[PDB]
């Protein structure tokens with residue numbers, strides 16, 4: 001179904017589709033989400049139009065999987081995911097990105113953490129991640145530009161693709177393993193709180209169509 005309410009959600013099987021217009025106050029416009037099918041893989045789209053607050057994210061419309069029981073990164077064997085998506089719109093300044101929070105405390109709220117991992121498959125416009133570039137790295141056979149910074153007490157690692165990766169297959173464990181083995185990330189003590197995929201828009205008009213999305217924690 002469709003809704004434009006700030007915190008609308010639609011649930012089906014193991015997926016939740018959310019409007020999550022948390023930064024609406026920073027600009028003028030709207031955001032709506034439509035959940036098409038949530039049996040097996042997820043199909044949904046996000047629609048929006050925003051002006052003002054040039055460098056402020058307006059929302060993170062997204063799909064995510066349910067994670068009733070939190071587990072440490074090292075305990076998880078694989079975090080496979082596939083994505084098929086395309087953007088349409090005008091003057092788009094937005095990304096297409098996975099977002100995952102982890103914390104040492106398994107009971108931490110699931111909308112923040114000690115760390116945030118982002119994987120940007122798409123990026124339109126001049127925008128960039130929080131923090132500064134740590135150079136390029138190879139993960140799962142694809143090259144990414146790695147960024148690092150702080151959002152309050154939360155450390156944020158964002159891996160950005162070198163082109164718009166509209167058809168993707170990977171394993172998010174490869175990214176956690178890179179941080180564990182190269183940046184001192186304590187995978188043995190951090191629990192995965194969320195596993196989400198969506199878009200952060202700044203300004204413009206756009207529709208993110210997600211034709212297919214899957215993810216799991218195994």
Ligand SMILES: *[C@@H]1O[C@H](CO)[C@@H](O)[C@H](O)[C@H]1NC(C)=O
Nearest residue numbers: 121122123124161162163164
């Ligand atoms: C997405 O495509 C546009 C134009 O082809 C480009 O400006 C932008 O950098 C691309 N994003 C990524 C992640 O490479």
